[PDB]
RNA sequence: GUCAUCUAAUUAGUGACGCGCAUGAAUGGAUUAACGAGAUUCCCACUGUCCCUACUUGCUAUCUAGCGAAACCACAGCCA
RNA sequence: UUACCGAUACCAAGCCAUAAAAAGAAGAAAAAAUUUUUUUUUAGAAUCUUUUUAUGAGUAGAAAAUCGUGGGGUUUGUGUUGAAGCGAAAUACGUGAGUUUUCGUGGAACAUCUCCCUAGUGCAGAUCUUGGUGGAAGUAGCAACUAUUCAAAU
RNA sequence: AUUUCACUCAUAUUAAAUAAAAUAACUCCAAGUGGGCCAUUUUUGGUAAGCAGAACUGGCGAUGAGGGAUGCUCCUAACGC
RNA sequence: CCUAUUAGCUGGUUAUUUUCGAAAGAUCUCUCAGGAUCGCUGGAGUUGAUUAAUAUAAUUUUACCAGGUAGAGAUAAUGAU
RNA sequence: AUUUUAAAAUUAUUUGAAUUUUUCUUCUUAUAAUUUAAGUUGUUUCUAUACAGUACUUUCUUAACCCACUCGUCUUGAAACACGGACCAAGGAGUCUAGCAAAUGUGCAAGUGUAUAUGAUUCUUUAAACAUUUUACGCAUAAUUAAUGUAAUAUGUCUAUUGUAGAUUUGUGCCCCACUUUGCAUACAAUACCGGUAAGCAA
RNA sequence: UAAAGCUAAAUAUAUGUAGGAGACCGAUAGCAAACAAGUACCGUGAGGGAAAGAUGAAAUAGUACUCAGGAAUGAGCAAU
C-alpha cells in the first residue's frame, strides 16, 4: 500500500521481485521483465507477481529526499563539503565507505561547525 | 477505454531539436527561436526552423542563382541558411548584400570585389530583427544525386529512377529490361 | 501438407489502416499521346501568343530605358 | 562503436530481433546472386532493369590512354584565368585573351552556356564542339585546333 | 539479395585469410630507407648519390 | 590478436546423437582427462572464443588535413582564453593574463631547478603542486602491462629554438613541450579536453602569425591555407538581444495559462 | 476346395481329384535307400505339462556388525 | 414491481510518465524574541523553468532514455586510523535495472557520474562446456567354485 | 483551345449535414510477417463432424479485468499508481 | 588433414523503463517447412496545418447512375411436369 | 515579486431609478470591509517536558481472508498425457573485414581526397604528430550510342526558357485581412536543345 | 632481334634465434603447456593428449613443552 509521512508519500514499498526467483535458486531476485510466451506475469495473470511501472514514480516535488526531508550528498573529503555551506538545510550529508578514521572525524566536525546533519555519523567508532 | 486515433496523443513529424553540436550553432539556434517566440514574424520563425535542418535541406545556393533571384529588388538582403557558392559560369557580379550561414572563400572574395558584402546570422538579427527588406531564398534541395534514385523503382513503367550499378558501360544493366531487342524494355 | 490456398480477410482491415488513398489530382496532365494535330496547332498558338507578349514586353522595355 | 550497436539493446529478448517463427537461418534463400531469373526475378526487374544479357560488340583490349578526352564546357573559358584578367580583357576591346585549354588538361571544348557578349576569345584545343565554334565565332573569336 | 542495392560484386569466394596483409611498418621503412640513402651519401664523401637522368 | 588457431587444435568429432549426450565436438581418445571433453567452440573450455580476434581490424583512421588543422587552431584559441584553461583544470587564478608569452631566454635555461622557479615566479605555483603530488599508481590491470602510474597534464611549453628549455622544463611531472612548427593536437588537446595552459615564447608566439598565413614566408606559412570563418560574427547573443533595436522589435510579453 | 482316412469332435496330418489366381523339366522335372541339434502329423511308453496344487533342500532375500554404489529427478505426488 | 450487490469499464480528486500546448534570457516575505536581534528562504540550468489539457494493453518488430562490466585518455580523488572482494543487513534512494551506506570478514590496492574513447561488456535454459554437490540411500548390493571347528602365539 | 483585359458568383455560419478533420500529405531506410484459427450471418462438398473449402464484419493470436462454477474465441468491458 | 565443409531443418540466443506496433493476404518461383516482391510496421525528414477552414472522411443528405441476388413465374420464353 | 487581480457575492453607510411593493426586491453612485470570490483553515489535547522502550519507523518470521497450475519453446491452440530443465558456480552466442547505399554530424566546395613516396635539430612516448617549388590518381564537374563517334536555348543579351500554385519581400486600405509587388524550394505541365532510333530530303 | 648464360638493390618472411613494445589475456582466460608440458596417461599403430600457480615480511620464525592416547590425533595454564 502507499506510505505516507508528511508531504512525501511513497506510492509503494515491497520492492518487485523477479518471477519465480522464490523457487529458485539460480534466479536472483533482482527484476528482471520476463519475456516468455505464455509467462503469467507477462500477461498479468491476476494473484502473480506484478510488474514495475511509471505509474509507481514518486512525484517529482519530493523524489529524491530523505525521510529527513533534504537530499543527500555523498563526501570523500571537507573540500566537497563547500557547497553544501550554502543549502545546508536542503542536503544531508552521506560519509562513502572507504573514507578512514583519519577523514571521518574531520568531515564530522566539519558539517558540525557547517550545521549540515551527518546520516552515517556513528560509523567506525 | 475510448476511441481515437493515435490514443489520443497529437502525433508531430520532423526535428525537433538541432542535432548538430557546434556550439555557436547552438547560440544561433537559442537567439533566433527567442526572435520567433517573442516577435511575430513568420519571417524569424522561418528562419529558425531551417537552422535546425539537415545538411541535405539546406543545400548551397550559386552566386549566379543568387544574383539571379535578387534581381528585381536591388536594395533588399538575400538571406539563405545554406552556404553560398562561388559559379565560375558567371562573368560578372553586382552589388549584392547577402546573408547567409557560410560563404565559400572565392565567393566571399568575389562579393567583397563586388562590392556587396556577406553577412552572418547574429549580425542580420542585430540589424533586420523582423526582415524587413529581407527575401528568403533557399537552394535546390531535390538536385542532389541521391534523388535521383528515388521515386518509383528503376524497372517500373516511365521511371526515371537511376540505378544503382558498378559503371555505365554497354555490358553493365543494358540488355534485358532496358530494349525492346531483349524481352521487354523498362 | 495441404495450403491454405485463398481468403481475403484482413485485407479490408489492412487497406483501411493507411486509409483509401485518393489521387493526388493535378492540374495539368500530360498530353503525350492525345490528339495530334490539335495540340500541336496548341504549340503553335501558344508559340505566337509568347512572340507577341515578349514583343510588347521588348518594345516596352526599349522605350522606357532609352 | 561496439556499444552504439543495435544488437545491444535486444540482449534480453530470446530472438535477437531476427524474429520467433522465421527465425535467422544461414542463406535461406541463396548464397550471392543466386536466385535472379528464378525467386529474386521480382527484385532483379525492379530495381536492375537490363541486367541479363548482351548487347554490343567486343572492344578486345582497351588502351583508355587513346580515348581520354576531357571536355570542358563554352561557359567556363572565361572562369578559366583570373578575375582581374577577366576585368583588363573586359573593359579593352583591342586584345582578346588566348586559352591553351589543353594546358589546363581538357581535350574538347563543348557548347554548353553562353559567352559574353561582343567579347573576343581565342581557344586553342584539340577538339571542339560545333555549337561550341559557332559561339565562340559569334562572340568574335575563334577557335584554333592544336595537338 | 533484397530492396534496393548494388548487385554484390565481393571477389571474396577463396581463401583470402592467408593473403591479407596489413602494413603496420609505412612510416618505420620509410625511416629505415631515409637512414639507409643518408648513410649512402654520408659514406660516398661528398659525391651525390643521384644521378642525371 | 589471439593466436590464428587457437582453441581449434584438436581432432574433430561430434558423435553425439544416441549418446545421451549434447551434440557438441568431443576430443577423441581415453585413458587422459580431455578425453570426451568438449572441444572448439564458443561456450567450451578452451574451445576458441566468439570471434577470434584479428591484426586486420580497422585499428587507425584517416582524418582529413583541413579539419586537423581546424582543430589545431580552435585548440590553440581556446588556450587563449582564461575561462577554458581554468574549467580544463589548471591552477592559474594568479597567472596574469592566460596567453601568457616569455622572454626568449626561456628557450636557453637548463637547469630544472631553475625551469620550477619560473614557473613559480609566473605564479603557476598550484599547478606546480597539482602536478607533483598528483603522481599515483593506477588502478586496475593496466599497471601489469608497464603503465603503472597517472599522472595529470601541466603546462605545455611552446618554444620556437632549442637551446636547453627541451632538457629543463622536462622531468618535471606532468609538463611537455612543443616546436612550434611542428605543434601537435594530442598535446593541445589531451584527452579532447578544450583548453590547454600553454607558455609560449616571445618568437614561437612572432611565428605563429608566419605560420598561418599573415607575413607569409616561404618554407614556413602553410601554404595556401585559409584560417576557419566562424559562422557568427560576435557570439555575444544576449548583448545583441538587449540591443535597443530588437527590443524595440519584440512586442509585450505574454503570460502562461 | 471336394471325396476318403485319422478323432468324439480335425482351418491340422495323410491318400486321392485337378480348366493349376500363378506347377513343370540342368530357373532342372519325378522318385529315392542312407544321413539330419532341419520342418510337420499320429501312436506306444513316460511323466506335476495339466486336473490342483502340497511338502521339502541349497543359495539369496530378511535382521545385525562392517562396507557401500547407480539409473532417475521442472516442482512434486489421494481421488470423482 | 422495487431495493440491493457487483469490474482493471464510467465519474470526481491526487500523483507518474507520454504527447501537445500557454509562456519565460530580478525584487523582500513571513515567523519568533526585544525600535534591535534570531530562523527559513530571497529562484532563472532553453533536451531548462512554471503552468494547462488529453492520453496510458500489447507477441513478432522498431526506437529513445536510462543501469551496469574489462580497459584508455582527461579531471579529482579514496586507501595499514584497512582497498578490492565476500556474508548479513538499511527508519536509505530509485519505478527499475541498480546506487549508496552499516556491521562482520578481509589485508592491498581502488574509483572517477567532469567529459569522451574502446570492447572478448550483462544468462535460467542450448540432452550447453568445465568443475563441484545432492535426493535416491546407509538403499541395491558385498550369492559360482560343498566347510569349517578347537586351542595357542603375535 | 490557349492568352490578356474587363464585370461578378453565398463567405457577416462557411455554394447540404456532421466531424478531439492537419493525429495531414509526401519522401527515404529498414524490421517482422507471408502455417492461422474462432463467432454471427451467407454458402460449396459431405450422411454428418470440434470435417474440408470460401464471403462480410468482429475477435482469438498479440490480451489481461468482472461474469458464464470450469474454459484461448461467449456477455460486459479492454489495462499507469 | 581439406574443415569451424554445407544445412530452405531442430535447439539456444544474456539489464531496466518508456513510446509506436504487425502479419498469417497477394504475385512470381523445381515453389508448398523456403525466398523475392507488394501489403501491414517503426525510425528519420521535409512540405503543410496551426486561421472552430480547406485539404480530408469504412458517415449521412440531395441529385443521378449500374445491377438481376432474395423473392415471383410456369398460363412470359427454354427446360421439365 | 507587476491577474489569489479584476469583477462576483455579502455586510455597513450612500446616489437615482425600476418593479413583481420589499426585514435575502432588483439595477448603479460612491466609500470601507469581508468571502459565498481567489483548490483548508482554526482550537484543544497527545506524542512529551524523551533521547530509543512495551511507544513510533523499518526489516524478518509466522498466521489469517481473497487470489494464485512449471518455466523456456515450437505452435491457431501448452498447466499439458508436447520437448529441455536434479542443484550450484564460472564460461556461453549478430562480431570483424571488404564493398555499396541511406541517414545524420563535420570540413571544404566545382571541386574534393594528398595515394605511394619524400623532408625534417621528431625519434621513450614518436608505429604519431608536422609538411608537400605556382596538369600524378580516384570520385565529381555531361550525356548518349553496339559503334566510327557526336555532345546540351544562342550572340539577339553579364539577358540567366514559359506557365499555374507557392515561401519571403514591397506599398494602400507598429498589432487583421483584401488589393498590388516580388515569385525561393517544390509539384504539375509546356517548351527548346544534346545523344540514339524512326520518317522526309540527301553532293 | 627467339631458339645460350650471369647479375646487386628496392620485395617477402604463421620458421629458428635475439632484442623492444602493446587501449591484448590474467590460471575454465592467454600457446596444448605460467608448474617435472608435448609431460602423465591412452591406442598394435598412424596418432590422441591432460590436470596442476598464491603460507608468511621473515620459516636464517614451518609449530618447542605438558597432558591424554598403541598410534593417528586432540587439548592446554604452553608456544612462533
Sequence with gaps: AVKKVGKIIKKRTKKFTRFQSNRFMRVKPAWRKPRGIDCRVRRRYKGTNLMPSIGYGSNKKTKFLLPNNKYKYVVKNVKEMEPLIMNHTKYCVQIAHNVSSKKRKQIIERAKQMNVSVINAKARL | ?186 | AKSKNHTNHNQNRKAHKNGIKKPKKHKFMSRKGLDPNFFRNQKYCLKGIQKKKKELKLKAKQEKNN | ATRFKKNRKKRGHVSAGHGRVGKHRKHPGGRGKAGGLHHMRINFDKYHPGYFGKVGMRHLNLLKNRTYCPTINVDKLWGLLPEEKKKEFSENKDIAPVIDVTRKGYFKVLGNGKLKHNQPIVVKARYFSSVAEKKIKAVGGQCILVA | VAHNNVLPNVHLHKWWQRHVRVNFSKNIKKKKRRLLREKRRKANGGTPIEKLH | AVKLGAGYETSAESWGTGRAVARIPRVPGGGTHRAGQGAFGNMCRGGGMFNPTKIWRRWGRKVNLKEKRYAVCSSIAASGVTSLVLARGHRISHLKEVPLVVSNDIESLSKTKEAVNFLVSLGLKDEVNRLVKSKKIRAGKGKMRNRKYKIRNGPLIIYENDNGVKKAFRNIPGVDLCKVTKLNLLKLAPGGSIGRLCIWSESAFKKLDVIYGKIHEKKVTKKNYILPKSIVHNPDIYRIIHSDKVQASLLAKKKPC
Design chain 2, 1 to 186: 477505454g475510448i476511441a481515437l486515433k493515435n490514443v489520443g496523443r497529437i502525433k508531430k513529424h520532423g526535428r525537433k531539436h538541432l542535432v548538430s553540436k557546434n556550439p555557436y550553432l547552438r547560440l544561433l539556434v537559442k537567439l533566433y527561436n527567442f526572435l520567433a517566440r517573442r516577435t511575430n514574424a513568420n519571417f524569424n520563425k522561418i528562419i529558425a526552423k531551417r537552422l535546425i535542418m539537415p545538411k541535405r535541406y539546406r543545400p548551397p545556393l550559386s552566386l549566379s542563382k543568387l544574383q539571379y533571384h535578387m534581381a528585381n529588388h536591388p536594395n533588399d538582403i538575400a538571406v539563405v541558411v545554406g552556404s553560398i557558392t562561388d559559379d565560375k559560369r558567371l562573368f560578372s557580379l553586382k552589388q549584392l548584400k547577402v546573408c547567409a550561414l557560410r560563404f565559400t572563400e572565392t565567393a566571399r572574395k568575389r562579393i567583397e570585389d563586388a562590392g556587396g558584402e556577406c553577412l552572418t546570422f547574429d549580425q542580420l538579427a542585430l540589424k533586420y530583427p523582423t526582415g524587413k527588406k529581407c527575401v528568403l531564398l533557399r537552394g535546390p534541395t531535390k538536385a542532389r544525386t541521391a534523388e535521383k534514385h528515388f521515386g518509383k523503382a528503376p524497372g517500373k513503367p516511365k521511371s526515371k529512377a537511376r540505378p544503382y550499378v558498378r559503371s555505365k558501360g554497354r555490358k553493365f544493366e543494358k540488355a534485358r529490361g532496358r530494349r525492346k531487342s531483349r524481352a521487354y524494355k523498362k
